[PDB]
């Protein structure tokens, strides 16, 4: 009902972080979807990260992530037996809005940009489930390299909006975009992004 409720602008290495339960999972191999809209000129940086709870390895070093690499969308995950990395054909860091959708069914993944053709990928077997219950970071983090194990080194400057995180637990209701302005547990150098 308010401009900016579902969008956030990141600058000067800002970020928001949400409790892990915004991206709750359950049973291994339950399908999961990430969808968001992004506008940025940033070539390399983190869009979304969820890794293991602080203090829990354990939970192994599993993670799910979305980001930009030389402007291309990248979807990268680790279930405990090797990383998958899916990369868009084209760069998306043109400062115009794009919709990006990342889907996973156990080891198998796909990405789609602007409702165009799928690109698929797989992580090596046998592991099928992500064990990560840490906070969900959007747009960056206070120390991106430490958070991501060096895989990313910065966030983005730009907006993320209409963030849908959904593990399709049997019987559960439809997902809804996350209220970025009222549900974060931590953040800095961010403001509502009208669009």
**DSSP 8-state secondary structure symbol assigned to residue 152:** -
Distance CA 137, CA 187 (A): 9
Alpha helices in 32-172 (DSSP H): 144-148
Q: Which helix (H) or strand (E) holds 167?
A: strand 158-167
Give the chain's domains with CATH numbers: 1-195 (2.60.120.200)
Cβ neighbours of residue 47 under 8 Å, at least 6 residues apart? Answer: 36, 38, 66, 67, 68, 138, 139, 156, 160
Distance CA 48, CA 89 (A): 20
Distance CA 130, CA 186 (A): 23
79 known ligand binder = yes
Distance CA 33, CA 169 (A): 12
162 known ligand binder = no
In order of 35, 73, 90, 132, the CA distances from 153 in angstroms are 23, 15, 21, 20
62 known ligand binder = yes
> What does the block give as tokens for 134?
């840490």
């Amino acid at each position: 009902d308010a401009p900016g409720q579902y969008g956030a602008y990141f600058h000067d290495d800002g970020f928001l972080a949400f409790p892990g339960h915004v991206f709750s999972r359950s049973l291994p191999e339950v399908p999961e979807t990430i969808e968001l809209e992004v506008r940025t000129s940033t070539a390399s940086g983190l869009l979304l990260w969820q890794g293991v709870e602080v203090g829990e390895a354990g939970q192994g070093k599993d993670f799910i992530s979305l980001g930009l690499q030389d402007g291309h969308l990248v979807f990268r995950y680790q279930l405990g037996s090797g990383e998958a990395r899916l990369v868009s054909e084209d760069p998306i860091n043109d400062g115009e809005w794009h919709r990006v959708t990342a889907l996973r069914e156990g080891r198998r993944g796909s990405i789609q940009v602007d409702g165009e053709e799928l690109v698929s990928g797989r992580s090596p077997g046998p592991n099928v489930a992500v064990n990560a219950k840490g906070s969900v970071y959007i747009g960056g983090a206070p120390d991106v390299a430490t958070l991501t194990g060096g895989r990313f080194s910065s966030g983005i400057t730009g907006c993320v909006k209409n963030l849908v995180l959904h593990s399709a637990r049997p019987g559960a209701p439809p997902p809804q975009p996350l209220d970025l302005q009222h549900r974060a547990q931590a953040g800095a150098n961010t403001r509502p992004c009208p669009s």
